Amino acid sequence: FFVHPCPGARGSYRATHRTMVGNIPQPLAPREFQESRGAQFDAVTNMTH
Amino acid sequence: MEATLEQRPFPYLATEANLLTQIKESAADGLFKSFQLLLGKDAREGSVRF
Amino acid sequence: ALDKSIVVNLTSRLFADELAALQSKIGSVLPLGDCHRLQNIQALGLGCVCSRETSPDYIQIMQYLSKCTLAVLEEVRPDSLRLTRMDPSDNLQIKNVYAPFFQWDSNTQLAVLPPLFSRKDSTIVLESNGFDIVFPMVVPQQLGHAILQQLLVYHIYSKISALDLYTTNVSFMGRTYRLDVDNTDPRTALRVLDDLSMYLCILSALVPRGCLRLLTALVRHDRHPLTEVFEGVVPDEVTRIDLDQLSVPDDITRMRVMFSYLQSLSSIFNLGPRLHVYAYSAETLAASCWYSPR
Amino acid sequence: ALDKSIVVNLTSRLFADELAALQSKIGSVLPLGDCHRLQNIQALGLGCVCSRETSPDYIQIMQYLSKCTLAVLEEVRPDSLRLTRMDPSDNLQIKNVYAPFFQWDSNTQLAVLPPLFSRKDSTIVLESNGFDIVFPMVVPQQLGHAILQQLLVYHIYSKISAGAPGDVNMAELDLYTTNVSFMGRTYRLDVDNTDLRVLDDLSMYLCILSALVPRGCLRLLTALVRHDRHPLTEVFEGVVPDEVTRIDLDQLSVPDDITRMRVMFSYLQSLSSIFNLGPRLHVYAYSAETLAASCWYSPR
Amino acid sequence: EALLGVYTNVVEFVKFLETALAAACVNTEFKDLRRMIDGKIQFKISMPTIAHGDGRRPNKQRQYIVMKACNKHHIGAEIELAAADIELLFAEKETPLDFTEYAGAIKTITSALQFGMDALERGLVDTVLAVKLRHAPPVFILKTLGDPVYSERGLKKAVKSDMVSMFKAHLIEHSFFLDKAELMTRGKQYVLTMLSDMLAAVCEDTVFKGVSTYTTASGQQVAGVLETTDSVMRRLMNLLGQVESAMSGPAAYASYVVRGANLVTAVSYGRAMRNFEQFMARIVDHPNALPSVEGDKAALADGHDEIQRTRIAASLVKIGDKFVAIESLQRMYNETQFPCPLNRRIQYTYFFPVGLHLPVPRYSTSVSVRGVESPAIQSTETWVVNKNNVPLC
Amino acid sequence: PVYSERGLKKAVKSDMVSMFKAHLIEHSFFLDKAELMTRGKQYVLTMLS
Amino acid sequence: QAENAARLGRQVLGLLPPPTHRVSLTRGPEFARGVRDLLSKYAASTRPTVGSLHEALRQAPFRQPTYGDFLVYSQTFSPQEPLGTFLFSFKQEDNGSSMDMLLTPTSLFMLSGMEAAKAPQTHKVAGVWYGSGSGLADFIPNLSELMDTGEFHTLLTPVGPMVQSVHSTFVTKVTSAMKGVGLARDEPRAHVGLTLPCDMLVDLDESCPMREPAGLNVTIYASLVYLRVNQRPSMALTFFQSGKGFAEVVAMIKDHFTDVIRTKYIQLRHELYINRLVFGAVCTLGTVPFDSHPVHQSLNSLPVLVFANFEAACGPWTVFL
Amino acid sequence: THEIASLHTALGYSSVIAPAHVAAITTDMGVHCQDLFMIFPGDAYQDRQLHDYIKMKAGGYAAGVPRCENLPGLSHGQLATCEIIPTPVTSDVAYFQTPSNPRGRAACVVSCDAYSNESAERLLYDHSIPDPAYECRSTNNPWASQRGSLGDVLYNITFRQTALPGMYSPCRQFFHKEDIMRYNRGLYTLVNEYSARLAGAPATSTTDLQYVVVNGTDVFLDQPCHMLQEAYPTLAASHRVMLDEYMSNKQTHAPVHMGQYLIEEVAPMKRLLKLGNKVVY
């Protein structure tokens, strides 16, 4: 979400959808969590580094 | 309290002097405020309640 | 339970002249204007709408007839008349007199009508009082409809002319009769003919194409009983409307609104009330019936 | 303190097969041309009008329906029936036995119609006296005006096929006409592959109207031209078709348009008289699993 | 083949006066609820105070005015009668077959008449027991308020939530106390302390407290009626005695007659008094006498001294010192395929998470698990034990 | 009568079915299970009554 | 309690329908001496003693209408009503088993969307009784479509007045009455009349002196007109009252909905839809003894008429145009 | 007809009801979720080419009693409903053992002053004030208790009655603004509403699913989660393990691991869990 006005008028409530998972901000998904999701992700489709 | 009319069934009393002159015209044209009509079947003792 | 009697006060003693025709119609039907036991003469006749000096029309008279209460005579005393009253649901004794004499039976079907053949016959005048008394005329509804059929004919053809074997004769099996039309008001018959364009032209719009094609299968090689009006000739109109190829569900919704408005044509071709007779004698001309405000 | 009881005596006893078909109902509706208390069987059906030898018709029933007196069964003894008279604005109990089975609803409106359906579904043939008794067709009014509606469409397009069958497809006919969609419910009637002929005279009428009726309005439009002529009827040039306004009254002579404009209005009344309804009874309360109703009669 | 009998069922008449509920009401016969609009009740509550010599503004005395009303109710019974009965009720009675048909059809209508009485006697029981639950707090909204120690102060923000964290101290532990009464070690002295908690916490205050309404044998005292089901009553007949099984109640009702000068204000004005003679002796006959207790009981008792006593049987048990009667209101409902109104149905909510995470310094308080240890795992499910004890993902 | 008088609907029938089991497992063989009870000789009398 | 069986035998055996007059032969000339209610004239003595006219008072005709018990979604029927309103039954499908929907005259204004330019009095009134319109249209999403083809009036079966209401928060019990004069449940020996809102009534008798006779009857009529506002379908209920017979009124109603017709048929001048040509119909509701007078009333404000001794003979819709 | 005038004589609570004997759990404590395709069928996606995919990949009345066609029988009692609130990944387990709200902020209104709109709103939907429960965090989430949040977008809505029967949703009990502000009054009046009255849209009884109730002539339910405005927790274990360690030893229970946890149930009723034959009270 964000708030902006028309030029010389009142403020509006206009929005976007955060598309990828990584556009969730850090205090909802910390860097230790998002790393621990990829390791679960790694052992399903079984990519070998 | 604004003390107004009531239709409760009193033991009414009637005088000697008549009243019935000009009444059909006068009560229809505001001779006295708060007048109550009687049209046939309504002319009876009202149902008491309390 | 109830009493159904209307005595009528009268302000002049009867002559032997005005007793004569009243004694003839000792049991008959006449409407009146009120609902009281006692009654003054200016309501008894129908002649508060069918007068002499006016030029009355019967549509207004018939429209007047559905308002009023209806009543049956009992006696003619010289002081004063005497009548009896017709409730919504009642069993009575009715006994017809009226002049072009038809015949009834059990399970017949009646309608109260204005005097439509002779104003001079049906209206006796009481010159001892001056106000005449006009009588209505009970007719079976097959002819009760058929006069109103013939009346709305006449006011059309008088105006476009602006003959009498055609325009003013109500036909019936056995006798062909003669109407009484010289001085009628054409304006309450104008209003009835006003509403007919509000049906007869609207029914012309949604004319079902399937029901049109049947006529070419009918009148072109197939003499039927009631189709002889066309006389074996197609009209020019049906040749012009049926260019389409038919379709079933299009003539469903057309045939719904066609079905709905024809339920409303009663509201312009009304009668007055009705009299469904359940018992009838021939040697007395007595009959019992039940009224219906309808 | 009035009384009403209509006993119908008989000549012959009923068979053990017929009485069970007459115990199948115990309360229904019979037209009954009577006011007496004892009566012979030649009136309690519709065989006085609708019988085998003469062909059946649909006005003469509907004439006889409003003319007649309705009545309700109470009991079938082997010797005799026992009907109950129907007073105007009475109150009694009604079950249905009618074919096919149109499910009721409480607080509805009923009309009384003739059976135009299958004869095995319609009537109960007596062999004890060799005389039919026929029941009227008790349908709610919206369904009754819709069950007539598409069957009357169905009979007209039949005659087109016998003249030239390349105009109506029967799959288009047996899909949009024999289907009733009311109360969210579907129904299916009898197509009658025996040959119908009850509703033919309406199709004799309403199609003979459809050349007379739109011919009829052009004379009425040029009739009473004034400045008294009613202001609503200016509007209805927009409704009348473009082709209708190109007709002369020239070719049809003045002595012939008399014979039109009497016969014009004559069908337009007698068709109103049957589309406006018959004798009726309103039903206020009802239960489905008993099929018993609660009525109040409304005459006409 | 053979008939071997027609067997009958005659319902025993349950009158409302001879139940065990009459101790929880005060019965007055009455004339016209179709006429009466309301019934006013005036409370005059004085309130003494303390003169104390602290440094404080003293307080004037007080006075309280409390308004009450009545409650309208309606009861409707619906007799059917068949028409063939109604005709030969007025039959001419001239044949020897009629005396098994006339007498066999009067038993359709007099059975249906006494049917109309028994639908009415439900309404005397049901519409009381409905309304006695319309004015019914639970336990936990009473006892925390039945402590005077908390309403000594005002009801300011401290005393409010101090109650709120005691409504839940009573909800979580002491609910369903008979279900806990088996699996506790003590048992019998847990129901007794739960119930005697309930009994003396009911602030009765009983305006008719002087009126000797319902005595037992030997002149003792009845202090109310607890009304339960039967599955609970059989648990209480074993834990508690039926020590006397004898009481005394009214043989009639209390009248309400508008004879005399009640009628004059009834017709001419709206209002109409109650015991207008007693109200007259306070004003014109012997006035200005100060209100005392010993002159109340000859007037506070409406007629409830003078109704003749009788013999009523029910269950009686000592609890503390207050005798309590126990009822069985299932015969009034389980005969007739109607629900019983005592068997209420408590619902709840259940809060529940799934799919979570924990912060950086993870740990393991654990007896023993060899299995899931790594931080690479992320659990994405939960498990609930069912009502019927099956864990579902 | 506490169970059935809602009418035997779809739910009430099968909640009885899970009481043909919690009474089957627990309260069966009421003589034999009441000889290894600490209370013992009262459990028989309550099962009888 | 032994005297309680008396009062349920007094008011019961004395309150029975009068039996059929059936008397056996062999007593003789007795069958006339039970006939009393046919006798209509009486011995008008010197002073009317009530002990001398009691038989002319004890006798009475047999008058009783019929009640119909309903069930209500407690939103459709507002928790207060003036006890003499008019009703319907909008029945569409057998949804549950004991399910029903009713319509007050104020509600059918709210379901419609017809404007205060046709009715500026009850528009302010019904806004507090119900929602902003969408509180009732949730039950029928077909109201955009049933109003197009004009099939709406086929589903309203009129009922008449009200008698008794047992109201709750969830289920509202409505005991209506057909055929009319129904005893109340508050007070015995009363007769619940009918009431209508003053905005919805339009009377037809008032004229210049200029003459029209009266009868025993005046017949309250109902109506409906499928008009169009904001290029959207929207009905138009009005009332009609006349003791003028059915012949005049269809010709008289077109003098009332006159200008509305000239507005609409400019819209379908440019396009043809055979489902649209229907316009509206007329019901029939019952009879009032003409020479009776409507007393005005007041609510919160709202003027409401009244009619005494209404009896409710219903009737269907006939499409006038 | 027969009409009774009943009266309340003394001004004391003289009628106490008490829940004593449990008889039959009916509503399964089941796992079945609630599907907004049957609560909001009036909406769909913009492209029907894709809305015809999701309903495939995910998923009336009879004799006056509601009855779903897609279950011809249950076994585990009345099949309950389960609901959906997106919640942050870093929410705290220590909130979840405690009887509290599904919201972020607690919501007990009785503590506020009487007849105040503003002083009662400041509990619910503010954030400068901390929680009345915690004080370091000021709300458990501004994704279910922010003034415009999804805890308000889903369930501020009063019950729209429909001819088709609606189904019950327990999250309305904790999210609806107008029903909670009815408890603004002093708590003696809050006794007298709790006995006779009834709130907005409670759940059914003797049905198949959890429908909305619309009859009132039979309902007996007195749920206290109206009044006290909290929601109790029951058992959960993000791996299978900790159920076993719950029932093996209760005293030396392990409540928290690195990735897994448990919530012990706290409820006014207490059952006997019976995996195998080990019995936890």
Short mmCIF file of C-alpha atoms in Angstrom, two decimals, chain G residues 6-269:
data_model
loop_
_atom_site.label_atom_id
_atom_site.label_comp_id
_atom_site.label_asym_id
_atom_site.label_seq_id
_atom_site.Cartn_x
_atom_site.Cartn_y
_atom_site.Cartn_z
CA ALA G 6 -68.33 -25.63 33.35
CA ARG G 7 -66.80 -22.56 31.66
CA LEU G 8 -65.33 -24.80 28.98
CA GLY G 9 -68.82 -26.17 28.42
CA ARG G 10 -70.63 -22.85 28.57
CA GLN G 11 -68.51 -21.05 25.95
CA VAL G 12 -68.22 -24.24 23.85
CA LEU G 13 -71.61 -25.95 23.66
CA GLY G 14 -73.16 -22.52 23.35
CA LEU G 15 -70.68 -21.71 20.58
CA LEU G 16 -71.42 -24.29 17.90
CA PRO G 17 -72.53 -23.97 14.28
CA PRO G 18 -76.33 -24.20 14.01
CA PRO G 19 -77.26 -27.73 12.95
CA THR G 20 -79.17 -28.69 9.84
CA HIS G 21 -82.92 -28.44 10.27
CA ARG G 22 -83.94 -32.11 10.29
CA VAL G 23 -87.15 -33.17 12.06
CA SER G 24 -88.91 -36.54 11.93
CA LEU G 25 -92.47 -36.70 10.65
CA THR G 26 -94.69 -38.32 13.24
CA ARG G 27 -94.85 -35.49 15.77
CA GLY G 28 -96.92 -33.55 13.23
CA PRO G 29 -97.08 -29.78 12.68
CA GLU G 30 -93.96 -28.93 14.67
CA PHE G 31 -91.37 -28.28 11.93
CA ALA G 32 -92.39 -24.63 11.58
CA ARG G 33 -92.03 -23.88 15.31
CA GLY G 34 -88.26 -24.16 15.33
CA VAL G 35 -87.88 -21.74 12.43
CA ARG G 36 -87.03 -18.41 14.01
CA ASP G 37 -84.35 -16.62 12.02
CA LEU G 38 -86.58 -16.29 8.97
CA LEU G 39 -88.96 -14.20 11.07
CA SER G 40 -87.96 -10.57 10.55
CA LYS G 41 -90.79 -8.34 11.85
CA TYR G 42 -91.60 -8.07 15.53
CA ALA G 43 -94.24 -6.87 17.95
CA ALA G 44 -93.41 -3.19 18.26
CA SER G 45 -95.02 -2.66 21.67
CA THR G 46 -95.48 0.58 23.62
CA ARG G 47 -92.10 0.72 25.31
CA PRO G 48 -89.21 -1.42 24.07
CA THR G 49 -88.43 -3.73 26.95
CA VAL G 50 -85.21 -5.68 26.44
CA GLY G 51 -87.06 -8.65 27.92
CA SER G 52 -89.51 -8.15 25.03
CA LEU G 53 -86.94 -7.73 22.23
CA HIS G 54 -84.43 -10.34 23.39
CA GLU G 55 -85.38 -12.84 20.70
CA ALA G 56 -84.82 -10.16 18.06
CA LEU G 57 -81.39 -9.75 19.66
CA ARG G 58 -80.42 -13.35 20.47
CA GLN G 59 -80.79 -14.32 16.81
CA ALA G 60 -77.91 -13.54 14.47
CA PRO G 61 -76.66 -14.54 11.03
CA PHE G 62 -73.68 -16.86 10.61
CA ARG G 63 -70.64 -14.67 9.99
CA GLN G 64 -67.11 -16.07 10.14
CA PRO G 65 -64.05 -15.52 7.94
CA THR G 66 -61.01 -17.76 7.53
CA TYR G 67 -57.54 -17.35 8.99
CA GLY G 68 -54.26 -18.32 7.37
CA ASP G 69 -51.16 -18.89 9.50
CA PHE G 70 -47.85 -17.85 7.92
CA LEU G 71 -44.10 -17.94 8.60
CA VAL G 72 -41.76 -15.00 8.00
CA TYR G 73 -38.07 -14.25 7.58
CA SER G 74 -38.10 -11.58 10.33
CA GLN G 75 -36.44 -9.02 8.04
CA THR G 76 -39.20 -8.83 5.40
CA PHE G 77 -41.96 -8.04 7.86
CA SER G 78 -40.93 -5.08 10.00
CA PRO G 79 -41.14 -5.70 13.77
CA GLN G 80 -43.92 -3.16 14.20
CA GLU G 81 -46.97 -2.80 11.98
CA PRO G 82 -50.19 -0.83 12.51
CA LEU G 83 -52.10 -4.18 12.80
CA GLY G 84 -54.38 -3.49 9.85
CA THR G 85 -52.01 -3.59 6.92
CA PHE G 86 -52.32 -5.28 3.54
CA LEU G 87 -50.39 -8.40 2.60
CA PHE G 88 -49.28 -10.63 -0.24
CA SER G 89 -47.53 -13.98 -0.62
CA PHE G 90 -44.63 -13.89 -3.04
CA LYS G 91 -44.20 -17.62 -3.55
CA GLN G 92 -41.56 -18.82 -5.99
CA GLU G 93 -40.40 -22.35 -5.10
CA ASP G 94 -40.98 -24.87 -2.30
CA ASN G 95 -37.64 -24.08 -0.71
CA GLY G 96 -37.87 -25.62 2.74
CA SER G 97 -41.03 -27.19 4.11
CA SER G 98 -42.50 -24.41 6.27
CA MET G 99 -41.19 -21.35 4.44
CA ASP G 100 -43.01 -18.22 3.30
CA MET G 101 -42.50 -14.59 2.31
CA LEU G 102 -44.89 -11.69 2.91
CA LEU G 103 -45.01 -8.12 1.64
CA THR G 104 -46.36 -5.03 3.39
CA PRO G 105 -47.46 -2.05 1.27
CA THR G 106 -44.40 -0.09 2.40
CA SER G 107 -42.10 -2.98 1.48
CA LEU G 108 -43.32 -3.21 -2.08
CA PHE G 109 -42.38 0.43 -2.40
CA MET G 110 -38.89 -0.50 -1.16
CA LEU G 111 -38.48 -3.59 -3.36
CA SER G 112 -39.44 -1.52 -6.40
CA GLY G 113 -37.34 1.58 -6.69
CA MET G 114 -40.24 3.80 -7.72
CA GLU G 115 -39.52 7.37 -6.83
CA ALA G 116 -40.90 10.00 -4.47
CA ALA G 117 -41.94 11.94 -7.58
CA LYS G 118 -44.77 9.38 -7.61
CA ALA G 119 -45.03 9.04 -3.83
CA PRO G 120 -43.31 11.70 -1.69
CA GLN G 121 -44.82 10.68 1.65
CA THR G 122 -43.89 7.09 2.54
CA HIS G 123 -40.42 7.33 0.97
CA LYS G 124 -39.24 9.03 4.16
CA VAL G 125 -41.29 6.55 6.19
CA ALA G 126 -40.07 3.17 4.95
CA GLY G 127 -36.39 4.16 5.12
CA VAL G 128 -36.35 3.51 8.85
CA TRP G 129 -38.54 0.38 8.66
CA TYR G 130 -36.16 -1.35 6.25
CA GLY G 131 -32.74 -0.95 4.70
CA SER G 132 -31.61 1.14 1.76
CA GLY G 133 -33.44 -1.24 -0.59
CA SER G 134 -30.87 -4.02 -0.78
CA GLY G 135 -31.97 -5.46 2.56
CA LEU G 136 -34.87 -7.23 0.82
CA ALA G 137 -33.58 -7.67 -2.74
CA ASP G 138 -31.07 -10.23 -1.43
CA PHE G 139 -33.88 -12.80 -1.21
CA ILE G 140 -34.84 -12.46 -4.86
CA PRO G 141 -32.08 -11.73 -7.41
CA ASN G 142 -34.68 -12.14 -10.16
CA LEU G 143 -36.13 -8.66 -9.62
CA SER G 144 -34.04 -7.26 -12.44
CA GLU G 145 -35.58 -9.85 -14.78
CA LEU G 146 -39.10 -10.53 -13.49
CA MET G 147 -39.75 -6.83 -14.03
CA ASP G 148 -38.48 -6.90 -17.62
CA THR G 149 -41.02 -9.32 -19.07
CA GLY G 150 -43.69 -8.18 -16.62
CA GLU G 151 -44.15 -11.62 -15.11
CA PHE G 152 -44.07 -10.25 -11.55
CA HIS G 153 -47.79 -9.79 -10.99
CA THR G 154 -48.55 -13.46 -11.69
CA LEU G 155 -47.00 -14.44 -8.35
CA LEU G 156 -48.73 -12.14 -5.85
CA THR G 157 -51.72 -13.82 -4.25
CA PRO G 158 -53.47 -11.19 -2.10
CA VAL G 159 -54.48 -12.02 1.45
CA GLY G 160 -56.01 -8.96 3.09
CA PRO G 161 -55.81 -7.61 6.63
CA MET G 162 -53.84 -8.59 9.72
CA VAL G 163 -55.15 -10.00 12.97
CA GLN G 164 -52.42 -11.32 15.24
CA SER G 165 -48.64 -11.05 15.37
CA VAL G 166 -46.30 -13.10 17.54
CA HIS G 167 -42.96 -11.46 16.89
CA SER G 168 -39.41 -12.59 17.69
CA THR G 169 -35.93 -11.61 16.56
CA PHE G 170 -35.64 -14.51 14.12
CA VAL G 171 -39.06 -15.98 13.31
CA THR G 172 -42.09 -13.72 12.97
CA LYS G 173 -45.53 -15.31 13.25
CA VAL G 174 -48.26 -13.61 11.20
CA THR G 175 -51.89 -14.66 11.52
CA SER G 176 -53.70 -13.01 8.64
CA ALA G 177 -57.33 -13.40 7.60
CA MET G 178 -59.24 -14.03 4.39
CA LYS G 179 -62.94 -13.10 3.94
CA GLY G 180 -62.56 -10.30 6.43
CA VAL G 181 -63.97 -9.39 9.78
CA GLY G 182 -61.72 -11.17 12.26
CA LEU G 183 -61.85 -11.03 16.04
CA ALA G 184 -58.71 -9.69 17.68
CA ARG G 185 -56.67 -11.50 20.31
CA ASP G 186 -56.09 -8.56 22.64
CA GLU G 187 -59.77 -7.95 23.30
CA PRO G 188 -62.88 -10.07 22.74
CA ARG G 189 -65.92 -8.49 21.06
CA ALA G 190 -63.70 -6.41 18.77
CA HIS G 191 -63.40 -6.39 14.99
CA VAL G 192 -60.06 -5.64 13.36
CA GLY G 193 -60.57 -3.33 10.42
CA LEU G 194 -58.23 -2.55 7.56
CA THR G 195 -55.73 0.29 7.16
CA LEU G 196 -53.90 1.67 4.12
CA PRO G 197 -51.28 4.40 3.69
CA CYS G 198 -52.66 7.73 2.49
CA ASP G 199 -49.95 8.14 -0.14
CA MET G 200 -50.87 4.90 -1.88
CA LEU G 201 -54.64 5.46 -2.05
CA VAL G 202 -56.25 7.33 -4.93
CA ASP G 203 -60.01 7.85 -4.67
CA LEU G 204 -62.40 8.21 -7.59
CA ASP G 205 -65.74 9.44 -6.24
CA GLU G 206 -64.95 13.09 -5.52
CA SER G 207 -66.35 15.44 -8.15
CA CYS G 208 -68.24 18.67 -8.73
CA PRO G 209 -71.94 18.61 -7.72
CA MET G 210 -73.21 19.08 -11.32
CA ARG G 211 -75.71 12.83 -10.17
CA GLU G 212 -74.52 9.37 -9.14
CA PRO G 213 -76.47 6.94 -6.93
CA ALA G 214 -75.03 4.76 -4.21
CA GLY G 215 -75.46 1.11 -3.38
CA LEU G 216 -74.66 -1.37 -0.62
CA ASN G 217 -71.07 -1.69 -1.70
CA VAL G 218 -67.76 -0.06 -2.45
CA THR G 219 -64.97 -2.24 -3.81
CA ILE G 220 -61.33 -1.58 -2.95
CA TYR G 221 -59.10 -2.24 -5.95
CA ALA G 222 -55.37 -2.86 -6.25
CA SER G 223 -53.09 -2.29 -9.22
CA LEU G 224 -49.56 -2.51 -10.61
CA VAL G 225 -47.76 -0.74 -13.48
CA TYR G 226 -44.39 -1.92 -14.80
CA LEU G 227 -43.00 1.56 -15.50
CA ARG G 228 -39.35 2.50 -16.16
CA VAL G 229 -37.13 4.92 -14.24
CA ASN G 230 -33.41 5.60 -14.93
CA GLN G 231 -33.66 3.26 -17.96
CA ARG G 232 -34.36 0.46 -15.46
CA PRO G 233 -37.51 -1.56 -14.70
CA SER G 234 -39.51 -0.49 -11.67
CA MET G 235 -43.10 -1.13 -10.76
CA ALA G 236 -45.84 1.25 -9.70
CA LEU G 237 -48.38 0.20 -7.11
CA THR G 238 -51.34 2.47 -6.53
CA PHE G 239 -54.73 1.84 -4.99
CA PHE G 240 -58.22 2.40 -6.32
CA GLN G 241 -61.57 2.68 -4.58
CA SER G 242 -64.98 2.92 -6.21
CA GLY G 243 -68.41 1.43 -5.79
CA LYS G 244 -68.87 2.09 -9.48
CA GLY G 245 -68.83 -1.45 -10.82
CA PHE G 246 -66.08 -3.13 -12.80
CA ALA G 247 -67.19 -1.62 -16.12
CA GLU G 248 -66.06 1.92 -15.43
CA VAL G 249 -62.85 1.43 -13.53
CA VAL G 250 -60.63 0.07 -16.31
CA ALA G 251 -61.71 3.06 -18.36
CA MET G 252 -61.09 5.27 -15.32
CA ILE G 253 -57.59 3.98 -14.49
CA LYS G 254 -56.32 5.09 -17.89
CA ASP G 255 -57.31 8.61 -16.85
CA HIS G 256 -54.87 8.16 -13.94
CA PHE G 257 -51.81 6.56 -15.57
CA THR G 258 -52.23 8.73 -18.64
CA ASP G 259 -48.97 10.66 -18.97
CA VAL G 260 -46.81 7.72 -17.87
CA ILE G 261 -47.88 5.81 -20.99
CA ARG G 262 -46.83 8.63 -23.34
CA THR G 263 -43.38 8.75 -21.74
CA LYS G 264 -42.61 5.05 -22.04
CA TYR G 265 -43.77 4.23 -25.55
CA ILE G 266 -41.19 6.64 -26.96
CA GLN G 267 -38.55 4.20 -25.63
CA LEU G 268 -39.88 1.09 -27.38
CA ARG G 269 -40.68 3.18 -30.46
#
